[PDB]
Design a protein around this ligand. Structure first.
Ligand SMILES: CCCCCCCCOCCOCCOCCOCCOCCO
Ligand SMILES: CCCCCCCCOCCOCCOCCOCCOCCO
Length: 772
């Protein structure tokens, strides 16, 4: 539908970038093709496809319409053979918006290098959950997304915190709009497991070792969440929802031009959710507001300012698990899926807010620059109280552990980068060069010295959460942890031949953890990034990459000598083939990857047996560890109204002990999510289903009362989702999702501090969405 245009004749480059903006569409073109060319005038309200053919008039250029992207090409009657991965500059530095693409495969992406590249161009495993996927499958928060993300396994620490493994590792790398947060521990990290999907276009997950743009982080993966953006045409929707266990949700999303010309624009969202659960006495209100204003200082300088805010506010939160495995005498406990060992008043509320600003500028060059400022708060308020220990006892009584943690973390980030093309041996290449600084400050209070509490209860079998609330007494501890991260990075992408793209970069890193622990310091650390992509046909490419990452150890991971262990460090080695079809409407990837860890913190038993250095009392050892496996995925259009996303991941990870590690992460996993839009009589109907399988997994947990280690197993299980949607009316639709159709009862945690969590039983969600 028609858009308001005004692009005066100028370099075809500026015109192409000015078009991308005014049209909310991403424009890709080759620098050396548009250089000495100029665009013809376009003026007025217009349909975008008329607009571009009108803009290119006189220029030799053609247009490949590609959903939210158009790519401009200029054909020659020469054409010696084709350069499919030729260097292409790009109007949207985050890549292609997925909203209204109607697809499950992503458009372009810059998760890997800061350079906008398509998944066939990206020489690392990159999986993306697209805006429409989130819509069709009910994926309302990051937990729901991860569960539906190929290669990811979500396991539970407690009601208010989950865990995401990839390739043998706990992911601790989150970004927002490509900006790393600090996530050293749960301190800095409040509400990361919980982000609402309402403010986002999509979450892109880079799996492997992602040091280059993450800086210091964990192995396995980065989860980069991309924010929703304002647009030039007015539009929004209102959505209202209702599912199993008094789970109710509203959501408002509004966006467009805020002045007659269009040079300031805004988008706003609020969503609210209040739900109980299968688990007894658990309930949880979340609120989310977001707001973004875009200003065009002038047509090649844009200033963006905005804020978001989320509060997660639960009741009956548990600390660890849903109930304890063994009782007082050592027998495995057997309890309803509703059992919830947290107190009625127990809360692990976790909150988040961001004030940010960006300036982005286009240089005559066709080079573009961007400055990003972030102020971020992660807060928690956790007066927790639950049953732990080896309970119940023969007489049915049990004991509460109740402690209270409050705190807040304030962050500031500046990031700057410059991106552009450049000629070298008579071919076109691109470079990114960036610098970044983050300072972040955790300040907390703890309470364990409880005045005059009687923490026993007289009925385990009927635990209602109905216990007293203690006198927290005075603070027990005061936290003060300041991290400082600086880094500078560089990648070049050489178009070496018409089939070979060579990727060369690094990041140099400075990292300081200051406060109540002895200082932790790592200076001038270098993180390599070497990769290549060789084209085989119009369809298939092979790629191989070598990527690195490290993370300075927690202060409490010292050795025999009482020396902080050296940074936890990894190299992902990856070789693979990617396939592309139907003009990028469908994508396939088959990969073999390997991970080499070093300094994986490990207890050190011989020593801990009997402390001899009185300096340390419980020392660790840094060992090596190795992850080997392969992965296949597919995403996009299988036929005309028929989308899938599917994956298959295999891994084993062992350490120098030889023994398997991360054994709760299954060794083999599988995801297939599909929907179909009929045509003709039924063309208002959309039908959807999905399955996720994973094989055997387990923990060794120690039955204390019996004085022996036991293995707990979760037998391989399927989970099936079903989905239908009918568009009754132009402006109004009604959906239903049913998850876990066969009501499979399984475990999402066995073994976390000797407890267990059950996965969601069958649940339905009903909703209507209304578009103005
Ligand atoms: C220092 C704090 C920075 C916070 C920035 C937050 C900005 C919040 O502003 C919300 C703007 O949203 C714009 C809503 O867009 C709706 C467009 O419709 C306009 C009215 O339509 C009239 C006839 O169509
Ligand atoms: C352990 C218990 C789980 C129960 C399992 C139930 C699964 C079967 O449910 C089938 C759902 O079909 C009901 C169809 O209702 C249609 C919904 O229409 C939406 C209304 O929108 C109103 C618009 O204003």
């Amino acid at each position: 539908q028609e858009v308001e245009f005004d692009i005066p004749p100028q370099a075809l480059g500026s015109a192409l970038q000015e078009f991308g903006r005014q049209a909310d569409i991403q424009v890709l073109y080759r620098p050396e093709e548009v250089r000495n060319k100029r665009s013809s005038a376009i003026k007025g309200k217009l349909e975008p496809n008329q607009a571009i053919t009108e803009l290119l008039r006189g220029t030799g250029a053609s247009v490949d319409f590609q959903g939210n992207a158009i790519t401009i090409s200029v054909a020659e009657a020469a054409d010696s053979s084709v350069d499919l991965g030729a260097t292409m500059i790009t109007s949207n530095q985050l890549g292609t918006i997925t909203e209204d693409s109607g697809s499950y495969t992503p458009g372009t992406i810059a998760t890997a290098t800061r350079l906008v590249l398509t998944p066939r161009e990206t020489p690392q495993s990159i999986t993306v959950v697209t805006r429409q996927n989130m819509d069709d499958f009910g994926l309302n928060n990051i937990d729901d997304v991860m569960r539906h993300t190929p290669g990811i396994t979500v396991s539970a620490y407690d009601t208010d915190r989950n865990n995401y493994y990839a390739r043998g590792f706990s992911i601790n790398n989150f970004q927002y709009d490509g900006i790393p947060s600090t996530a050293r521990n749960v301190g800095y990290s409040a509400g990361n497991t919980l982000s609402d999907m309402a403010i986002y276009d999509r979450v892109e997950v880079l799996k492997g070792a992602t040091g280059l743009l993450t800086g210091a982080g964990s192995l396995g993966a980065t989860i980069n969440l991309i924010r929703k953006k304002p647009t030039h045409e007015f539009k929004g929707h209102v959505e209202l929802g209702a599912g199993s266990w008094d789970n109710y949700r509203s959501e408002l999303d509004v966006s467009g031009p805020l002045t007659e010309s269009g040079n300031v624009r805004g988008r706003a969202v609020a969503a609210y959710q209040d739900k109980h659960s299968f688990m007894d006495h658990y309930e949880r209100k979340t609120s989310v507001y977001y707001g973004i204003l875009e200003f065009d200082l002038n047509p090649d300088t844009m200033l963006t300012v905005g804020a978001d805010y989320q509060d997660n506010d639960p009741k009956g939160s548990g600390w660890s698990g849903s109930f304890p495995l063994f009782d007082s005498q050592g027998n495995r406990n057997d309890v309803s899926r509703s059992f919830n060992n947290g107190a009625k008043w127990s809360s692990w509320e976790q909150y988040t807010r961001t004030v940010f600003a960006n300036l982005e500028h286009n240089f005559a060059n066709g080079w573009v620059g961007k400055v990003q400022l972030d102020h971020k708060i992660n807060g928690y308020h956790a007066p927790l109280g639950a049953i732990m220990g080896d309970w119940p006892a023969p007489d049915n009584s049990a004991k509460i552990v109740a402690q209270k943690y409050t705190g807040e973390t304030k962050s500031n980030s500046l990031d700057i980068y410059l991106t552009g093309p450049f000629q070298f041996l008579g071919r076109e290449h691109e470079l990114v060069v960036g610098t970044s600084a983050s300072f972040s400050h955790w300040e907390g209070k703890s309470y364990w010295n409880l005045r005059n509490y009687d923490n026993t209860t007289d009925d385990f079998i009927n635990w209602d959460g109905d216990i007293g609330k203690p006198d927290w007494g005075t603070p027990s501890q005061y936290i003060d942890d300041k991290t400082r991260q600086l880094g500078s990075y560089m990648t070049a992408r050489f178009n070496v031949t018409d089939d070979l793209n060579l990727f060369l970069g690094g990041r140099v890193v400075d990292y300081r953890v200051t406060g109540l622990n002895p200082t932790i310091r790592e200076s001038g650390r270098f993180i390599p990034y070497v990769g290549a992509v060789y084209d085989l046909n119009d369809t298939y490419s092979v790629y191989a990459s070598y990527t690195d990452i490290f993370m300075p150890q927690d202060s409490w991971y010292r050795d025999s000598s009482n020396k902080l262990l050296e940074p936890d460090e990894g190299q992902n080695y990856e070789i693979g083939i990617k396939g592309e079809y139907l003009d990028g409407r469908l994508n396939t990837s088959l990969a073999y990857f390997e991970i080499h860890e070093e300094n994986r913190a490990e207890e050190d038993a011989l020593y801990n047996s009997k402390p001899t250095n009185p300096a340390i009392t419980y020392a660790y050892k840094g060992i090596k560890a190795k992850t080997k496996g392969y992965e296949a995925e597919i995403s996009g259009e299988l036929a005309p109204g028929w989308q899938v996303q599917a994956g298959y991941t295999h891994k084993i990870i062992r350490d120098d002990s030889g023994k398997k590690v991360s054994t709760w992460e299954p060794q083999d996993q599988l995801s297939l999510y599909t929907s179909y839009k009929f045509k003709g009589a039924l063309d208002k109907l959309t039908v959807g289903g999905g399955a996720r399988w994973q094989g055997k997994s387990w923990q060794m947990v120690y039955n204390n009362p019996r004085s022996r280690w036991e293995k707990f197993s979760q037998e391989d299980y399927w989970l099936v989702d079903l989905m239908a949607r009918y568009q009754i009316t132009d402006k109004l639709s009604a959906s239903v999702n049913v998850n876990n159709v066969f009501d499979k009862t399984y475990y999402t945690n066995i073994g976390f501090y000797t407890s267990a969590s059950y996965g969601d039983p069958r649940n339905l969600m009903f909703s209507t969405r209304w578009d103005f």
